[PDB]
Design a protein around this nucleic acid. Sequence first.
RNA 1: CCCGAAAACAGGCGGCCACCGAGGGCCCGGGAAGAAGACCCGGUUGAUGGGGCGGGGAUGUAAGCGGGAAGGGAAACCGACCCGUUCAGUCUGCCGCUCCCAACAGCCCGAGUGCUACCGGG
RNA 2: AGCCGAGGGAACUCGGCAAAUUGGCCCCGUAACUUCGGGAGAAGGGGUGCCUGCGGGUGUGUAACCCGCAGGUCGCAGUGAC
RNA 3: GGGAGUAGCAGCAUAGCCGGGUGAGAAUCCCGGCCGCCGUAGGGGCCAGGGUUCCACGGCAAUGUUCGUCAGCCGUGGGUUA
Lengths: 62, 89, 344
Amino acid sequence: ARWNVCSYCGREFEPGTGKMFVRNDGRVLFFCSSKCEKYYFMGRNPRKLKWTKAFQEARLQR
Amino acid sequence: PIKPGEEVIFVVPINKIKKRVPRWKRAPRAARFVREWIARHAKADEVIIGTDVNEKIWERGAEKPPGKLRVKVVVEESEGKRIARVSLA
Amino acid sequence: KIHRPRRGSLAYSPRKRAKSIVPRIRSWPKDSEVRMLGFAGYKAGMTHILMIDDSPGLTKGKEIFVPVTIVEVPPLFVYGIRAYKQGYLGLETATEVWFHDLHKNVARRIKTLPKNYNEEAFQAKLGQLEDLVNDGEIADVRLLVHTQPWLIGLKKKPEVMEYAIGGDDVKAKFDYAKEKIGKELRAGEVLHEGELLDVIAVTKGKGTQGPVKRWGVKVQFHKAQRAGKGRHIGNLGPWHPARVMWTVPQAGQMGFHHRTEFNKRLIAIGENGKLVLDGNEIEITPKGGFPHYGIVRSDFLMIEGTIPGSFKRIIRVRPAIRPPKKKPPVERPQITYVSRESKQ
RNA sequence: CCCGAAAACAGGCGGCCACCGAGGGCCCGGGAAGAAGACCCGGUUGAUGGGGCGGGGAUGUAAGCGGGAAGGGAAACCGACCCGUUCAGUCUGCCGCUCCCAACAGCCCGAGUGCUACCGGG
RNA sequence: AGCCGAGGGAACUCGGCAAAUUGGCCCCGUAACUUCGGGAGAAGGGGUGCCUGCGGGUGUGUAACCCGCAGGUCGCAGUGAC
RNA sequence: GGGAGUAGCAGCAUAGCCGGGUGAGAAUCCCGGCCGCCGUAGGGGCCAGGGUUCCACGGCAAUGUUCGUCAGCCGUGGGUUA
Ligand SMILES: [Zn+2]
């Protein structure tokens, strides 16, 4: 029972939950929720959302 | 109960009766709910609702009354029966 | 002709509201061990675990996802003993003895209780029954029991039930009962972890429903959907017999039925809302509380799978009456993860 | 496994009253039940609905204030938008604690008689 | 009488009935056949918001109407509804 | 007479609420405010046709798909100037 990490929001999600999206070239993505999946594919940028970790990292980048 | 002359504050939940009625009848039903609620909780035989309270109930149309009212109540005695008067807080 | 099977089953007819909301048990299993053959509690919620598979099949030895329902089981009070003899057609009640010291709240259910009935009269009646049992006149002995829902702040009105006892010797059963009367019973003293159980409850209510939902009939062609007969059936039958048959599907009550569900595994028995892993104790109540329920505080069963009923409802449990040959072993399985995250 | 004392031999058992009155229903606060009826829970020996204080959640960082901004302008200044304050603000047909408000006051239905054939003891 | 619907995409049905799709303006580009007038908006492809500045036409005009360019910036989406 | 105190009084414009008044009696009549509908017509003007339906005062047995203290209804008196 190990905890996977989300490719959009960077938080950990519990065993028996979420999704693995597989590209044909082999790159694997993990999603905690439909929210994150849908935002990632319609193109919202997580570096501007204060409920993600990429925001903290980009603030460090300011 | 509550004793006359006193100024009391009540929060009325209109969320409750929302979704009992169709959207276009929500404000007129909220009025009756307010009257019934304050009668029950002030133990009054009559309720007189201020025009300012009615206007706040109807501020955004007939479809969107507020979810929680804050109101001031004063009870008076005359001839026996209790009469409650409602204003805005 | 095109052939196909009929729409729904005829084995649960008439499809009516249950007689009572407390479920009765019609048949009992054969168990050599002299014990009380079941228990009762209140449904609380669902969650899931991850565990190493113990059942036969492939996936044995593998980690797997398993869903779980939690039943809160405070202790029962044994208030009486009842004796059964053989009648002309079947069993007939001979005599009951009630205990003398009962909780106040039992009168909310049994409105007319005895008044004086001292300890001494109690012992005299038990002696009467012991002599009756020693004579040879008696075919069966059963316990009379009631719930205590005031220890969990759910209710004050109790549920009153009658349970059976395992084994063959009527005298041995009676000795068990004489030990148990006037004392509390806890689920650990009766059930074994890893056992298969049958579960009995009244199903969720849905009211009046039509035949698409009640019997699984087809929706009609879109022409009929525009003609006003989309969610109807076509016809009530042939010209002769010149009557509607009872077998033809129609609308009515759906849900609030009596149902029994076979072979659900008990996975763990807990204590005071906590479960013991290898080293640590963990609260099974999830963050924020079980929805449409609150916080589990007394004692609980984990039963894998799904069970009938709404959340705050009385559930009865017995040992399996119709189990398979290839059983899982009667030990607690090795659990690796329990979900405690919010369920809302 | 499901229905099942209207099974006309129309049943068995424990207990209460009776030969004013056990007990029931309406009314009241509600919902896990529900087309009307019915079912279920509670009613100050109380956490049933609401409020207040907290928890868990949904969305996505409010208004105000300050500091910048491609360029323009004698200059004071204009400027879509960006950053800080700020996992914020708004909401909650979920949970907990707390008697702060309301579960007050009542109104209806309700079994009593014997004859002869007796039954087991008076 | 209306709104949405995962994965498939006419397997439904006498029959794609009904519903969906497309949609305004500017630029590019446009088959067979032809009574040489048409076909033709054939088909098919790109672009479109806000703010800041520059320019043109007519005009006496920092009056009024119309036509182009460059840059910055936000959003899943700029004929954003109709 | 039964059908039956049943169907219908929905669909094309879903509209009322609060306070005060009249009166034996007010969801349905009057005053004020809030909220709404029409807005190249549901607004303004006026033929034919109708014939007093026009105005004021007083009424509510019947008419008005409910009520009615209201009315194109009932009664009493008036009103059309080249
Ligand atoms: Zn995520």
